[PDB]
Symmetry: D2
Amino acid sequence: CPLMVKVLDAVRGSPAINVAVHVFRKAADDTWEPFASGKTSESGELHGLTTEEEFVEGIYKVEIDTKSYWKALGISPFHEHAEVVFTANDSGPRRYTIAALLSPYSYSTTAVVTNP
Amino acid sequence: CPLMVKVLDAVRGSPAINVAVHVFRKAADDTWEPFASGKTSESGELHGLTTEEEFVEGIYKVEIDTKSYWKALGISPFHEHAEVVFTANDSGPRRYTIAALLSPYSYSTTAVVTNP
Amino acid sequence: CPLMVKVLDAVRGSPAINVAVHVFRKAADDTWEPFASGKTSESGELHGLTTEEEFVEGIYKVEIDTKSYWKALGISPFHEHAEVVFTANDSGPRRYTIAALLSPYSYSTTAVVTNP
Amino acid sequence: CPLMVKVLDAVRGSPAINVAVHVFRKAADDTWEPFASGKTSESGELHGLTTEEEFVEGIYKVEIDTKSYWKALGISPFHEHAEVVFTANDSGPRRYTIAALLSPYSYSTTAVVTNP
Ligand SMILES: C[C@H](CON=C1c2ccccc2-c2ccccc21)C(=O)NS(C)(=O)=O
Ligand SMILES: C[C@H](CON=C1c2ccccc2-c2ccccc21)C(=O)NS(C)(=O)=O
């Protein structure tokens, strides 16, 4: 796991379960190419998006589909998604955990980056 | 004037209105002595807590009574209150705004320290 | 007037001054069309981005150029920018303040939606 | 582990290592009695504070000594500590993770509460 996504619900104090996550990588023509996707587990975590081989240098966007998550709980939230955009691996491979804490009208995101 | 408190509600996307706020100063015997208090306004703000003359260097605690705010909304909260504890410094900027962003199981707090 | 942006620096406890901010609207072909932009003031605020007349319902993106802000400070940051993506609604309150709290490896964003 | 504390550094994007944490429990006479203490590990986590037997109903305060953490990194931060105050186990035993995200002039805290 060079890339993990962890999502928490700040209203319930719980993992945010079954939240859709789409990862994109900026292509040579400046467009966002689909890179990987998945859903968070019971623990609010999404493992296995990629491999150290596949996860090369680049600019990556992690789009967490928070609006669908709130709507299913009966809540009409402000944001369409939480986006996280960053350059990865530009000094060598690292392991990235992208953490998102969700409320209906706010979210935070935090990266924890470790040298493998 | 030298100390303002501002409180926002991350669930409703609004000022947190009618939130009790208690300020204490630490006494020489290490106890907390009541110093000032009030309730946030319609804009989620509490002004007028103290004066330049009274707000001398020392250790202060700002308690924000968050549990009663969520209970009034019928939302089950985790914390009894949010506490913000700091040392007032004369060398720095002259105005302290303590901002607090509230969710039922999370809060953040940020000090913005400026020259007025 | 209907859309304000406010940015704070959690490392220095200050407004984040001179931060570029770009607003886009989503077009019918699903692309992002430039809509408005500016730089935060000394108070970390950006006013005057749009008018009531122009700010019709639709999907908007607010990009806050955080990486250039940290680089100017000599602090190595994680994100390229902070994006805030939302649907403007006429049924709700009439003013949207997008607040962003910045740290090098984390940010939060909160929408405060009020009647002016 | 009915009680875990996890601390992250938002400036470095890393676990906050060797941070002192003191837990107190409100006594019958309304005073704060020492309950447990420890330091965060390499992973920014502090396990083993208590047991399900020892961790009875009550009002608990988790004091995270963030000022000492920043000072050792050369930073003079705003807060003396991050305090987290909550009622525990009042509907039966639960498992509590208290997470704190630290910046020099801001912090957030979030509880994740699971029914064992
Ligand atoms: C515009 C403001 C919300 O944002 N302002 C913030 C502010 C002003 C001074 C210091 C810290 C903060 C802050 C921190 C986090 C989120 C918003 C704000 C707001 O709530 N508007 S109102 C109707 O006057 O209450
Ligand atoms: C990479 C991962 C970080 O996990 N991040 C969490 C986080 C970030 C922001 C807010 C809440 C949480 C959280 C809560 C529970 C468990 C993990 C995390 C982690 O394991 N950190 S480390 C290397 O052991 O120090």
